[PDB]
DNA sequence: TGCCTGGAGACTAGGGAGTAATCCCCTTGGCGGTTAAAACGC
DNA sequence: CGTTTTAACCGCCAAGGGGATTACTCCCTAGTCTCCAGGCA
């Protein structure tokens, strides 16, 4: 269209099909169905929602407005999954 | 010169399991993190280390879930992961 | 650092800097080398924004709760998100309210007939990129041939566009150029009209873009107008740019009014009498 | 005269004792608890560093990287059981292709 | 200042391998691992002394903590070394 | 005069304050924090007992038994997600028939 | 129902927390240019 | 696998806003002593 490009791509579509494909290949999957993408996108969205909620609560308890790395480390440590190499 | 399906898949599997590179681009994941955090609180800043740790944790969880669903699919005598495979993996792990 | 940034003190520091800098920088003016400048021309025209954006500026319900960039985008033109078109004009075509939502587009509509009748090619310098697409859509609505250039648009197409513009009988009477992407990349010896858009916090690039209309050998009187909104962020930004220019000085809508601003002679007012009559009929 | 030399260790006994005191784990802390904890910590660190050095020498590398740490902690079943719930940044996953996919 | 376990891990590495070095990322990972193990053992000993209605963290509490957290061989050798260290601390 | 009466709760704020003091959770404790925690505990027990009484009335029983508590915990999704890892004596969770194994 | 110890009230003070003053560094938003990566089709 | 497209990565421009600091204040809670009634047998 000459008037405008009219691009409304959603932000959740940032993780594209080859990214999920590489993740599955790293996980050890040979052949991948076509419906895996939406499912893993929803799973990633739920996980990020939980972790971000925990980190936001942690950083709001300290009255700070910047989400630091230690906040995410504590949020991950709360859910029984400790991450190393960041603090 | 074309190859029969399955061999390039195995080559890519070997390449990715050997290396430790990030399989998700930085800017899309950062934008998604910011969008998801907008729902909890507006006008929030983010350090690069924070989004990097988020990306690392997400990739680790995703590859663990992919290994689990691959095992579940192999249990079904198949070589194709399906949505129900991931659902069963999440139900057995308890993080549903 | 302590003494250089001090500008008694400004006079002494400037005297020492001149005494020590004289063998470094050479600078000459057009009025001294060629003396072929028809006028000192420089113009700022003010306008007002629709109440729909004035309410948002006054209330800041979604801003005070990025703010500067969003305010500049709003002041530039509306219809920057799909919801705006979906609410105002679901057809997303060229229709009413396109040239009324902002004073910049009202002025553009009022002055386009004079550019068409007079034949003076107009270069419009822009800071934002979506504003360039909105201007392209508006010019398509106006059935006016124009040139579109932007940063990293194409490697070789820029040369073809420059060659086409340089044609002695080109049928394009306007071109849109990004301010940051200018870089003196075009020798504008066939145009005399310049439009300045978004405020460009860096006066260096503003002056660089404005100076394009004064190439050596130009025969037509140059007219450069900068469109600034009032009672908004744009006015404050213009004031800050003026303060920056004053600091650098120490180291470095009526038909008759628009006619007087744009006409070079009484014959141009005679020609624009028809445009004025058409504007009166439309009003 | 530092207590680490008396005990024969390389870890700071005083720092460990201070962390145990100001950590509010209890109201009193004995004198054998800091040296014992430092001994356990230095033993674990020595084991992990030895495994990482062996892994790096196998990969003809003279500088330990997170990949070598991941390989060393996942090869040994004991540390794998200990740090099973702990992910390591820039460590990836060990290469393991199934027989039905080869 | 900013305290860390960098120099101690570096000395242990140079005492176990004199040729192979260590990077900053691996050093931070080792420091985080040391902190995690320290906090685990400290919490274990604290709750153990609390379950016995005690208030003095001693060698027995840390020994029970490491026997509970470290599984199998990783426990045994450790406590042995621990005992050894304790004995040496009684020597001087 | 008890502070719980002033606050309006039935749980003893003094007992919670003493437990937080002698529990070695911090070096000092506030005055409103024990009341807050007692109110949270009171609300939680109120919800649990309400759901247990509803389950008992549904089963036509005049007393609360561990089966009623288990049913009340497993029925509500909120408490199920909260109490997912804890197991309770007198087990069994949910009578349900599978539509695929008829 | 009877008994008592944990709970409560009054007084003292000091140290951790609240608040003001100061500043720079990390972040946010945007644009240029290049190109390896993403999209569409058989 | 190909061909067409395009958004990600490295590089630059600008700004201002919390995250750091230090200094002063201040009042909340830790005691210590004296009653006493809610909780226990």
Curated annotation (Swiss-Prot), chain A:
The modification Phosphotyrosine is found at residues 37, 74. The modification N6-acetyllysine is found at residues 2, 17, 45, 65, 77. The modification N6,N6-dimethyllysine is found at residue 6. The modification N6-methyllysine is found at residue 6. The modification N6-butyryllysine is found at residues 2, 17, 30, 63, 65, 77. The modification N6-succinyllysine is found at residues 17, 63, 77. Demethylation is performed by JMJD6. Monomethylated, dimethylated or trimethylated at Lys-6 (H4K20me1, H4K20me2, H4K20me3). Monomethylation is performed by KMT5A/SET8. Trimethylation is performed by KMT5B and KMT5C and induces gene silencing. The modification N6-propionyllysine is found at residues 2, 17, 30, 63, 65, 77. The modification N6,N6,N6-trimethyllysine is found at residue 6. There is a cross-link at residue 17 (Glycyl lysine isopeptide (Lys-Gly) (interchain with G-Cter in UFM1)). Keywords: Acetylation, Chromosome, Citrullination, DNA-binding, Hydroxylation, Isopeptide bond, Methylation, Nucleosome core, Nucleus, Phosphoprotein, Ubl conjugation. One of its GO terms (molecular function) is protein heterodimerization activity. Residues 2-6 bind DNA. There is a cross-link at residue 77 (Glycyl lysine isopeptide (Lys-Gly) (interchain with G-Cter in ubiquitin)). The modification N6-glutaryllysine is found at residues 17, 45, 63, 65, 77. GO terms for cellular component: nucleosome; nucleus. The modification N6-lactoyllysine is found at residues 2, 17, 63, 77. Core component of nucleosome. Nucleosomes wrap and compact DNA into chromatin, limiting DNA accessibility to the cellular machineries which require DNA as a template. Histones thereby play a central role in transcription regulation, DNA repair, DNA replication and chromosomal stability. DNA accessibility is regulated via a complex set of post-translational modifications of histones, also called histone code, and nucleosome remodeling. Belongs to the histone H4 family. This is Histone H4. It comes from Xenopus laevis.
Curated annotation (Swiss-Prot), chain B:
The modification Phosphotyrosine is found at residue 3. The modification N6,N6,N6-trimethyllysine is found at residues 18, 41. A lipid is attached at residue 72 (S-palmitoyl cysteine). The chain holds residues 40 to 135 of 136 of the full protein. The keyword Cytoplasm does not apply. The modification N6-lactoyllysine is found at residues 18, 41. The modification N6-crotonyllysine is found at residue 18. Core component of nucleosome. Nucleosomes wrap and compact DNA into chromatin, limiting DNA accessibility to the cellular machineries which require DNA as a template. Histones thereby play a central role in transcription regulation, DNA repair, DNA replication and chromosomal stability. DNA accessibility is regulated via a complex set of post-translational modifications of histones, also called histone code, and nucleosome remodeling. The modification N6-succinyllysine is found at residues 18, 41, 84. The modification N6-glutaryllysine is found at residues 18, 41, 77, 84. Keywords: Acetylation, ADP-ribosylation, Chromosome, Citrullination, DNA-binding, Hydroxylation, Lipoprotein, Methylation, Nucleosome core, Nucleus, Palmitate, Phosphoprotein, Ubl conjugation. Belongs to the histone H3 family. The modification N6-(2-hydroxyisobutyryl)lysine is found at residues 18, 26, 41, 84. The modification Phosphothreonine is found at residues 42, 69. One of its GO terms (cellular component) is nucleosome. The lineage of its organism: Eukaryota, Metazoa, Chordata, Craniata, Vertebrata. The modification N6-acetyllysine is found at residues 18, 41, 77, 84. The modification Phosphoserine is found at residues 19, 48. This is Histone H3.2. It is found in: Nucleus; Chromosome.
UniProtKB/Swiss-Prot annotation, chain C:
It is found in: Nucleus. Catalytic component of the chromatin structure-remodeling complex (RSC), which is involved in transcription regulation and nucleosome positioning. RSC is responsible for the transfer of a histone octamer from a nucleosome core particle to naked DNA. The reaction requires ATP and involves an activated RSC-nucleosome intermediate. Remodeling reaction also involves DNA translocation, DNA twist and conformational change. This is Nuclear protein STH1/NPS1. It comes from Saccharomyces cerevisiae (strain ATCC 204508 / S288c) (Baker's yeast). Interacts directly with SFH1, CSE4, histones H3, H4 and H2B, and via its N-terminus, with RSC8. Interacts with LDB7, NPL6 and RTT102. Component of the two forms of the RSC complex composed of at least either RSC1 or RSC2, and ARP7, ARP9, LDB7, NPL6, RSC3, RSC30, RSC4, RSC58, RSC6, RSC8, RSC9, SFH1, STH1, HTL1 and probably RTT102. The complexes interact with histone and histone variant components of centromeric chromatin. Residues 107-252 form the Helicase C-terminal domain. Transmembrane segments: none annotated. Belongs to the SNF2/RAD54 helicase family. Present with 1990 molecules/cell in log phase SD medium.
Curated annotation (Swiss-Prot), chain E:
Keywords: Acetylation, Chromosome, DNA-binding, Glycoprotein, Isopeptide bond, Nucleosome core, Nucleus, Phosphoprotein, Ubl conjugation. Its main location: nucleus. GO terms for molecular function: DNA binding; protein heterodimerization activity; structural constituent of chromatin. There is a cross-link at residue 88 (Glycyl lysine isopeptide (Lys-Gly) (interchain with G-Cter in ubiquitin)). GO terms for cellular component: nucleosome; nucleus. The keyword Glycoprotein applies. Glycans are attached at residue 80. It is found in: Nucleus; Chromosome. Monoubiquitination of Lys-88 by BRE1 gives a specific tag for epigenetic transcriptional activation and is also prerequisite for histone H3 'Lys-4' and 'Lys-79' methylation. GlcNAcylation at Ser-80 promotes monoubiquitination of Lys-88. It fluctuates in response to extracellular glucose, and associates with transcribed genes. Core component of nucleosome. Nucleosomes wrap and compact DNA into chromatin, limiting DNA accessibility to the cellular machineries which require DNA as a template. Histones thereby play a central role in transcription regulation, DNA repair, DNA replication and chromosomal stability. DNA accessibility is regulated via a complex set of post-translational modifications of histones, also called histone code, and nucleosome remodeling. The nucleosome is a histone octamer containing two molecules each of H2A, H2B, H3 and H4 assembled in one H3-H4 heterotetramer and two H2A-H2B heterodimers. The octamer wraps approximately 147 bp of DNA. This is Histone H2B 1.1.
């Amino acid at each position: 269209a000459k008037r405008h490009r009219k691009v409304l791509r959603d932000n959740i579509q940032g993780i594209t099909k080859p990214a999920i494909r590489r993740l599955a290949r790293r996980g050890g999957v040979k052949r991948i169905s076509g419906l895996i993408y939406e499912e893993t996108r929803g799973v990633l969205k739920v996980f990020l929602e939980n972790v971000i909620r925990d980190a936001v609560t942690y950083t709001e308890h300290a009255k700070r407005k910047t989400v630091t790395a230690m906040d995410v480390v504590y949020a991950l440590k709360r859910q029984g999954r400790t991450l190393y190499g960041f603090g | 010169h074309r190859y029969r399906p399955g061999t390039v898949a195995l080559r890519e599997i070997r390449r990715y399991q050997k290396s430790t590179e990030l399989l998700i681009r930085k800017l899309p994941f950062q934008r998604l993190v910011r969008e998801i955090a907008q729902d909890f609180k507006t006008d929030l800043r983010f350090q690069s280390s924070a989004v990097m740790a988020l990306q690392e944790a997400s990739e680790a969880y995703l590859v663990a879930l992919f290994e689990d669903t691959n095992l579940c699919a192999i249990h079904a005598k198949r070589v194709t992961i399906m949505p129900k495979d991931i659902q069963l993996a999440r139900r057995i792990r308890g993080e549903r | 650092e302590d003494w250089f940034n001090t500008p008694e003190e400004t006079l002494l520091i400037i005297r020492r800097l001149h005494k020590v800098l004289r063998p470094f920088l050479l600078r000459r003016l057009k009025k001294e080398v060629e003396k072929d400048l028809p006028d000192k021309v420089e113009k700022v025209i003010k306008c007002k924004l629709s109440g729909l954006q004035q309410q948002l500026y006054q209330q800041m319900l979604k801003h005070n709760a990025n703010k500067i960039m969003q305010l500049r985008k709003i002041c530039n033109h509306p219809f920057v998100f799909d919801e705006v078109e979906g609410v105002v004009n679901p057809s997303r075509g060229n229709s009413d309210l396109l040239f009324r939502v902002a004073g910049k587009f009202e002025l553009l509509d009022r002055v386009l007939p004079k550019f068409k009748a007079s034949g003076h090619r107009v270069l419009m310098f822009f800071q934002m990129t979506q504003v360039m697409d909105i201007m392209e859509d508006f010019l398509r609505m106006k059935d006016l041939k124009y040139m579109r250039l932007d940063g990293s648009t194409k490697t070789e197409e820029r040369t073809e566009m420059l060659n086409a513009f340089n044609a002695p009988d080109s049928d394009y009477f306007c071109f849109l150029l990004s301010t940051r992407a200018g870089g003196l990349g075009l020798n504008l010896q066939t145009a005399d009209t310049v439009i300045i858009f978004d405020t460009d916090w860096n006066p260096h690039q503003d002056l660089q873009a404005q100076d394009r209309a004064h190439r050596i050998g130009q025969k037509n009187e140059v007219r450069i107008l900068r469109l600034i909104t009032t009672d908004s962020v744009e006015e404050v930004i213009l004031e800050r740019a003026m303060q920056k220019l004053d600091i650098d000085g120490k180291v470095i809508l009526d038909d008759d009014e628009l006619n007087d601003t744009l006409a070079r002679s009484a014959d141009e007012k005679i020609l624009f009498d028809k445009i004025d009559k058409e504007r009166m009929n439309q009003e | 005269k530092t207590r680490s030399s008396r005990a024969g260790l390389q870890f700071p006994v005083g720092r460990v004792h201070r962390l145990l005191r100001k950590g509010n784990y209890a109201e009193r802390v004995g004198a054998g608890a800091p040296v014992y904890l430092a001994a356990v910590l230095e033993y674990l660190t020595a084991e992990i560093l030895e495994l990482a050095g062996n892994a790096a020498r196998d990969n003809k590398k003279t500088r330990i990287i997170p990949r070598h740490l991941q390989l060393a902690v996942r090869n040994d079943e004991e540390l794998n059981k200990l740090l099973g719930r702990v992910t390591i940044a820039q460590g990836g996953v060990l290469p393991n292709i199934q027989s039905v996919l080869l | 200042r900013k305290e860390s376990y960098a120099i101690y891990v570096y000395k242990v590495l140079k005492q176990v391998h004199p040729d192979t070095g260590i990077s900053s990322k691996a050093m931070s990972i080792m420091n985080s691992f040391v902190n995690d193990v320290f906090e685990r053992i400290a919490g274990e000993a604290s709750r153990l002394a609390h379950y016995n209605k005690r208030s003095t963290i001693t060698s027995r509490e840390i020994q029970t903590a490491v026997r509970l957290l470290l599984p199998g061989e990783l426990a045994k050798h450790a406590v042995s070394e621990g005992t050894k260290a304790v004995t040496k601390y009684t020597s001087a």
